Design a protein around this motif. Structure first.
Motif, PDB file in Angstrom:
ATOM      1  N   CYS A  20      26.911  -9.003  26.636  1.00  0.00           N
ATOM      2  CA  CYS A  20      26.963  -8.474  25.291  1.00  0.00           C
ATOM      3  C   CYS A  20      27.457  -9.605  24.380  1.00  0.00           C
ATOM      4  CB  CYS A  20      27.933  -7.265  25.142  1.00  0.00           C
ATOM      5  SG  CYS A  20      28.007  -6.680  23.439  1.00  0.00           S
ATOM      6  N   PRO A  21      26.577 -10.143  23.518  1.00  0.00           N
ATOM      7  CA  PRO A  21      26.952 -11.257  22.599  1.00  0.00           C
ATOM      8  C   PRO A  21      27.942 -10.836  21.532  1.00  0.00           C
ATOM      9  CG  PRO A  21      24.739 -10.472  22.124  1.00  0.00           C
ATOM     10  CD  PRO A  21      25.156  -9.770  23.355  1.00  0.00           C
ATOM     11  N   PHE A  22      27.990  -9.541  21.218  1.00  0.00           N
ATOM     12  CA  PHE A  22      28.938  -9.032  20.241  1.00  0.00           C
ATOM     13  C   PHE A  22      30.355  -8.947  20.798  1.00  0.00           C
ATOM     14  CE2 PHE A  22      24.834  -7.011  18.919  1.00  0.00           C
ATOM     15  CZ  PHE A  22      24.646  -7.784  17.778  1.00  0.00           C
ATOM     16  N   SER A  23      30.495  -8.447  22.026  1.00  0.00           N
ATOM     17  CA  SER A  23      31.765  -8.459  22.731  1.00  0.00           C
ATOM     18  C   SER A  23      32.355  -9.887  22.810  1.00  0.00           C
ATOM     19  CB  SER A  23      31.576  -7.947  24.164  1.00  0.00           C
ATOM     20  OG  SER A  23      31.368  -6.522  24.101  1.00  0.00           O
ATOM     21  N   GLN A  24      31.518 -10.816  23.215  1.00  0.00           N
ATOM     22  CA  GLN A  24      31.980 -12.187  23.443  1.00  0.00           C
ATOM     23  C   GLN A  24      32.416 -12.801  22.133  1.00  0.00           C
ATOM     24  OE1 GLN A  24      31.109 -16.379  25.697  1.00  0.00           O
ATOM     25  NE2 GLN A  24      29.385 -15.007  25.419  1.00  0.00           N
ATOM     26  N   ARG A  25      31.647 -12.602  21.069  1.00  0.00           N
ATOM     27  CA  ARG A  25      31.998 -13.078  19.700  1.00  0.00           C
ATOM     28  C   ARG A  25      33.414 -12.608  19.343  1.00  0.00           C
ATOM     29  NH1 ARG A  25      28.688 -11.009  14.475  1.00  0.00           N
ATOM     30  NH2 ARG A  25      27.016 -11.356  16.094  1.00  0.00           N
ATOM     31  N   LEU A  26      33.678 -11.294  19.517  1.00  0.00           N
ATOM     32  CA  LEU A  26      35.027 -10.811  19.133  1.00  0.00           C
ATOM     33  C   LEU A  26      36.150 -11.352  20.015  1.00  0.00           C
ATOM     34  CD1 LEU A  26      34.267  -7.120  18.201  1.00  0.00           C
ATOM     35  CD2 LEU A  26      34.554  -9.100  16.664  1.00  0.00           C
ATOM     36  N   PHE A  27      35.902 -11.436  21.296  1.00  0.00           N
ATOM     37  CA  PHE A  27      36.816 -12.035  22.266  1.00  0.00           C
ATOM     38  C   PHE A  27      37.144 -13.494  21.815  1.00  0.00           C
ATOM     39  CE2 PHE A  27      39.175 -12.846  25.848  1.00  0.00           C
ATOM     40  CZ  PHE A  27      38.738 -12.456  27.079  1.00  0.00           C
ATOM     41  N   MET A  28      36.122 -14.298  21.487  1.00  0.00           N
ATOM     42  CA  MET A  28      36.277 -15.662  20.976  1.00  0.00           C
ATOM     43  C   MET A  28      37.074 -15.744  19.676  1.00  0.00           C
ATOM     44  SD  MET A  28      32.643 -17.424  21.971  1.00  0.00           S
ATOM     45  CE  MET A  28      33.070 -19.049  21.358  1.00  0.00           C
ATOM     46  N   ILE A  29      36.835 -14.814  18.770  1.00  0.00           N
ATOM     47  CA  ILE A  29      37.520 -14.775  17.485  1.00  0.00           C
ATOM     48  C   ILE A  29      39.019 -14.549  17.728  1.00  0.00           C
ATOM     49  CG2 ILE A  29      37.956 -13.512  15.358  1.00  0.00           C
ATOM     50  CD1 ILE A  29      34.786 -12.961  15.378  1.00  0.00           C
ATOM     51  N   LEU A  30      39.342 -13.546  18.536  1.00  0.00           N
ATOM     52  CA  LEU A  30      40.742 -13.204  18.834  1.00  0.00           C
ATOM     53  C   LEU A  30      41.449 -14.358  19.556  1.00  0.00           C
ATOM     54  CD1 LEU A  30      40.258  -9.478  19.698  1.00  0.00           C
ATOM     55  CD2 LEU A  30      41.626 -10.373  17.848  1.00  0.00           C
ATOM     56  N   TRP A  31      40.725 -15.005  20.483  1.00  0.00           N
ATOM     57  CA  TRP A  31      41.243 -16.179  21.183  1.00  0.00           C
ATOM     58  C   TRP A  31      41.591 -17.262  20.159  1.00  0.00           C
ATOM     59  CZ3 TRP A  31      39.676 -16.907  26.788  1.00  0.00           C
ATOM     60  CH2 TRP A  31      40.383 -17.971  27.360  1.00  0.00           C
ATOM     61  N   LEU A  32      40.607 -17.626  19.349  1.00  0.00           N
ATOM     62  CA  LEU A  32      40.785 -18.683  18.370  1.00  0.00           C
ATOM     63  C   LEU A  32      41.918 -18.385  17.390  1.00  0.00           C
ATOM     64  CD1 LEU A  32      37.125 -19.697  17.660  1.00  0.00           C
ATOM     65  CD2 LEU A  32      38.905 -21.180  18.731  1.00  0.00           C
ATOM     66  N   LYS A  33      42.073 -17.131  16.975  1.00  0.00           N
ATOM     67  CA  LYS A  33      43.206 -16.773  16.088  1.00  0.00           C
ATOM     68  C   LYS A  33      44.581 -16.943  16.760  1.00  0.00           C
ATOM     69  CE  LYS A  33      41.217 -15.487  12.106  1.00  0.00           C
ATOM     70  NZ  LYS A  33      41.407 -16.263  10.793  1.00  0.00           N
ATOM     71  N   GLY A  34      44.632 -16.830  18.094  1.00  0.00           N
ATOM     72  CA  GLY A  34      45.900 -17.030  18.847  1.00  0.00           C
ATOM     73  C   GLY A  34      46.865 -15.843  18.798  1.00  0.00           C
ATOM     74  N   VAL A  35      46.341 -14.669  18.460  1.00  0.00           N
ATOM     75  CA  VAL A  35      47.129 -13.438  18.351  1.00  0.00           C
ATOM     76  C   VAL A  35      47.203 -12.814  19.742  1.00  0.00           C
ATOM     77  CG1 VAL A  35      45.002 -12.066  17.870  1.00  0.00           C
ATOM     78  CG2 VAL A  35      47.254 -11.234  17.009  1.00  0.00           C
ATOM     79  N   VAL A  36      48.258 -12.042  20.019  1.00  0.00           N
ATOM     80  CA  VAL A  36      48.255 -11.246  21.245  1.00  0.00           C
ATOM     81  C   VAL A  36      47.139 -10.180  21.122  1.00  0.00           C
ATOM     82  CG1 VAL A  36      49.558  -9.749  22.670  1.00  0.00           C
ATOM     83  CG2 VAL A  36      50.648 -11.703  21.768  1.00  0.00           C
ATOM     84  N   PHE A  37      46.383  -9.992  22.193  1.00  0.00           N
ATOM     85  CA  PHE A  37      45.450  -8.898  22.328  1.00  0.00           C
ATOM     86  C   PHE A  37      45.285  -8.545  23.790  1.00  0.00           C
ATOM     87  CE2 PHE A  37      43.047 -12.765  22.481  1.00  0.00           C
ATOM     88  CZ  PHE A  37      41.951 -12.526  23.360  1.00  0.00           C
ATOM     89  N   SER A  38      44.779  -7.341  24.033  1.00  0.00           N
ATOM     90  CA  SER A  38      44.373  -6.941  25.357  1.00  0.00           C
ATOM     91  C   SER A  38      42.849  -6.725  25.387  1.00  0.00           C
ATOM     92  CB  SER A  38      45.109  -5.652  25.772  1.00  0.00           C
ATOM     93  OG  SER A  38      44.756  -4.566  24.938  1.00  0.00           O
ATOM     94  N   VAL A  39      42.278  -6.735  26.581  1.00  0.00           N
ATOM     95  CA  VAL A  39      40.845  -6.496  26.767  1.00  0.00           C
ATOM     96  C   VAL A  39      40.603  -5.401  27.817  1.00  0.00           C
ATOM     97  CG1 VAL A  39      38.673  -7.603  27.507  1.00  0.00           C
ATOM     98  CG2 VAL A  39      40.261  -8.848  26.075  1.00  0.00           C
ATOM     99  N   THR A  40      39.821  -4.389  27.431  1.00  0.00           N
ATOM    100  CA  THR A  40      39.440  -3.295  28.311  1.00  0.00           C
ATOM    101  C   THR A  40      37.922  -3.210  28.434  1.00  0.00           C
ATOM    102  OG1 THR A  40      41.416  -2.106  27.679  1.00  0.00           O
ATOM    103  CG2 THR A  40      39.593  -0.824  28.540  1.00  0.00           C
TER     104      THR A  40
END
Length: 228
Positions: A20-40
């Motif tokens: 899913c290219p949309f999932s990966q885009r958001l995962f990359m965005i959150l990574w790049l921002k450096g914020v805490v997040f979880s993934v389910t």
């Protein structure tokens, strides 16, 4: 920081990160921002009752932000860029607006190429795919070049959008059409090489096998062309 959970499509085993290219885009965005997040991960063929209660009928990807459900990849991207902003966080919007449109025509040419089942149409569709790749290549090799990414030497929202798509195109066209992005497109290859060295991209990619499987009922197989 805010409480962020990213919900993405599960892969073929119902647990892995799926295609899913949309999932990966958001995962990359959150990574790049450096914020805490979880993934389910979310298995769409066996959706958990608790998730249907949280987000009735919502297909991944989506997030919760301080427990509030937010949907639509483009709107989520805009919200994250707005809220998670300088000085504390990196601005990820490209400086050059052409970065936002570069390569955005590739996916549709790819999709037609791999869904086509008439051998007679193959070359036309392959050429159209190559023409769009060529445009991206020229963008990557034109001064805004030895730069690492679309917009410069830092990853931007434009990379988060394009890289997942280009990766799918590379894997799936190879598996189902024996198609290679020409080595002569040196701008594309410089870019992909740079990206495959970055954990933000590699760690958020589904496996080759998962990408291939996701397309096993989409890609239509063609008879091998017979010379003369």
């Amino acid at each position: 920081e805010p409480l962020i959970e990213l919900f993405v499509k599960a892969g073929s085993d119902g647990e892995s990160i799926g295609n899913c290219p949309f999932s990966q885009r958001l995962f990359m965005i959150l990574w790049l921002k450096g914020v805490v997040f979880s993934v389910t991960t979310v298995d769409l063929k066996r959706k958990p009752a608790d998730l249907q209660n949280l987000a009735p009928g919502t297909h991944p990807p989506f997030i919760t932000f301080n427990s509030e459900v937010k949907t639509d990849v483009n709107k989520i991207e805009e919200f994250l860029e707005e809220v998670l902003c300088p000085p504390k966080y990196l601005k990820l919007s490209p400086k050059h607006p052409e970065s936002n449109t570069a390569g955005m025509d590739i996916f549709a040419k790819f999709s037609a190429y791999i869904k086509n089942s008439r051998p007679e149409a193959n070359e036309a569709l392959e050429r159209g795919l190559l023409k769009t790749l060529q445009k991206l290549d020229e963008y990557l090799n034109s001064p805004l070049s030895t730069r690492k990414f679309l917009d410069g030497n830092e990853m931007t929202l434009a990379d988060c959008n394009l890289l997942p798509k280009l990766h799918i195109v590379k894997v799936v066209a190879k598996k189902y059409r024996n198609f290679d992005i020409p080595k002569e497109m040196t701008g594309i290859w410089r870019y992909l090489t740079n990206a495959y060295s970055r954990d933000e991209f590699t760690n958020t990619c589904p496996s080759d096998k998962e990408v291939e499987i996701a397309y096993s009922d989409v890609a239509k197989r063609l008879p091998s062309k017979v010379p003369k």
